Design an enzyme around this catalytic site. Structure first.
Site, PDB file in Angstrom:
ATOM      1  N   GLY A 149      38.825  22.827  -7.011  1.00  0.00           N
ATOM      2  CA  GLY A 149      38.858  22.709  -8.064  1.00  0.00           C
ATOM      3  C   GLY A 149      38.653  24.461  -8.994  1.00  0.00           C
ATOM      4  O   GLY A 149      38.609  25.350  -8.319  1.00  0.00           O
TER       5      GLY A 149
ATOM      6  N   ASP B  78      48.698  11.568 -16.819  1.00  0.00           N
ATOM      7  CA  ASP B  78      48.744  13.074 -15.984  1.00  0.00           C
ATOM      8  C   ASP B  78      48.800  12.470 -14.760  1.00  0.00           C
ATOM      9  O   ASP B  78      48.483  13.067 -13.892  1.00  0.00           O
ATOM     10  CB  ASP B  78      47.449  14.215 -16.345  1.00  0.00           C
ATOM     11  CG  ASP B  78      48.567  15.082 -15.231  1.00  0.00           C
ATOM     12  OD1 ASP B  78      49.990  15.690 -15.779  1.00  0.00           O
ATOM     13  OD2 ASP B  78      47.614  16.499 -14.955  1.00  0.00           O
TER      14      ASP B  78
END
Ligand SMILES: COc1ccccc1Nc1cc2[nH]c(-c3cnco3)cc2cn1
EC number: 2.7.12.1
Length: 255
Positions: free
Chosen positions: A20, A133
């Protein structure tokens, strides 16, 4: 060769799975030679709103453990002011990399995966969580079983607009997740998302909200699968099918 400690227990790193921003996921082995996934999060450049979004998500993952096996196992964690270490079960692959690597998907495999997605997403809704999402990257294949890896709470295939509901483009309802799940199933059926053909992101957002833009549902031997798709991909969230309704649908129930 490298090593790390989490709550006194020692883990040897096998390979890096994910990355990430300030986070990394590693495939690891414990002292008993058992395989796990460790998510490392660097909190050095994280503000209070970021820290609390991270803590809120960890608490929901830990709580929802019990309520469904379609949610990734979180065995343990270590959290300080500098870092987070999360000891989790290791998946085989995420759904996005699996869908990209495999050309044609078995209808049985598709149906099984769909059931898993509904169970996981249903579970978070029962606790007041709306992911908002969802995308194939949020799902992990763990022993022929799809598991949800996140709840969309923590500050973040990032950026993607292909699974975005029309109401989210205008601006917060469980129906937003239904649209996204419908896009994942549309991809598992037709090998593309409903607006994947539109390169330009502005024109793509214009078409998702456009009611005059007819989504194509080509004819397939599974008429019940076509109906689920047409029901999930209804632009008005009021006209859109709900998760409890999807769980009672022929496609999921009938053999
Ligand atoms: C061999 O392992 C993989 C290879 C490619 C993609 C995914 C996996 N497995 C994996 C990836 C994972 N990501 C997270 C994760 C990231 N944010 C929260 O949980 C847990 C986890 C557990 N197992």
């Amino acid at each position: 060769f490298q090593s790390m400690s989490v709550k006194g227990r020692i883990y040897s790193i096998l390979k890096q799975i994910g990355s990430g921003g300030s986070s990394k996921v590693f495939q690891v082995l414990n002292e008993k030679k058992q395989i796990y996934a460790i998510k490392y999060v660097n909190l050095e450049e994280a503000d209070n709103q970021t820290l609390d979004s991270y803590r809120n998500e960890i608490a929901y993952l830990n709580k929802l453990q019990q309520h469904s096996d379609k949610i990734i196992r979180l065995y343990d964690y270590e959290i300080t002011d500098q870092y987070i270490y999360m000891v989790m079960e290791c998946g085989n692959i995420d759904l996005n990399s699996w869908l990209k690597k495999k050309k044609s998907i078995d209808p049985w495999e598709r149906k099984s995966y769909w059931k898993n997605m509904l169970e996981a997403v249903h579970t978070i809704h029962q606790h007041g969580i709306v992911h908002s999402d969802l995308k194939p990257a949020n799902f992990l294949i763990v022993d022929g079983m799809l598991k949800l890896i996140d709840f969309g709470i923590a500050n973040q295939q990032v950026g993607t607009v292909n699974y975005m509901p029309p109401e989210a483009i205008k601006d917060i309802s469980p129906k937003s997740d239904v649209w996204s799940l419908g896009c994942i199933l549309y991809y598992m059926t037709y090998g593309k998302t409903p607006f994947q053909q539109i390169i330009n992101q502005i024109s793509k957002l214009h078409a998702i909200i456009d009611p005059n833009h007819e989504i194509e549902f080509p004819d397939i031997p599974e008429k019940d699968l076509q109906d689920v798709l047409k029901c999930c991909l209804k632009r008005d969230p009021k006209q859109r099918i709900s998760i409890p309704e999807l769980l009672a649908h022929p496609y999921v129930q009938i053999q």
